[model samples]
Target: SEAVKKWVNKIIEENIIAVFAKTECPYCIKAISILKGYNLNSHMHVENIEKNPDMANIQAYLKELTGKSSVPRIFINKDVVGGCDDLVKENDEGKLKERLQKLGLV
Candidate 1:
């Protein structure tokens, strides 16, 4: 758990955007696929936590960090951006692209 905490935090800190996801999860698919249309310039980081041995530990720690216990927990600049539905809504509203523009990602 301690190791997971460190690893997760490091990823968040090191990326312009960080996505904690499961490869086969529908919500994760929604977020990842939609995000692909935008140019993040490779600043985004996506990890399939289910591929790791400490999946549960990582999920639990993510809950502790973001107060959301679900896959596709997305972050931009170390801040929680919510999950798939939230991402979709933001995209529809053009808010996601606005943020990316501010970050010089798009």
Candidate 2:
């Protein structure tokens, strides 16, 4: 499990934006696009579920760690910002923008 933990932590930690995604996932694709609107795409880090199939376990770990799990789990700093629909709703209320500005993402 150390290997899994190491990769997952490396994929998630110390990044302003972290996106857990799979190439074939439609919502996962959408989430990444929605994130680009935030203009912070370059700052985002990705965990590809395809390459790291064990990331299915990482999703389990994330659920234990944050109570949510999906291929498109997005984090702003260390906070769980949720999935595609969640990300869509975030920008709708303008919370995403505010949070981004707080972190100087603007």
User: What are the per-model C-alpha RMSD values against the true structure?
Assistant: 1.3, 1.6
Candidate 2: 10-residue stretch with minimal lDDT: 47-56
| Per-residue lDDT of candidate 2, residues 1-106 (tens digit) | 7787676677677678988887689998888888887788778887787676586788787787667876678888878888888888988999989889999898
Clash counts for all predictions: 0, 0
Per-residue C-alpha lDDT of model 1 across residues 71-97, encoded as one tens digit per residue: 999999897888999998999899999
Scored against the true structure, residue 48 in model 1 reaches a CA lDDT of: 91
Clashing pairs in 2: none
lDDT of each structure?
0.87, 0.81
Candidate 1: worst 10 consecutive residues by lDDT? Answer: 32-41
TM-score of each: 0.91, 0.87
> After best superposition, candidate 1 residue 1: deviation in angstroms?
3.2
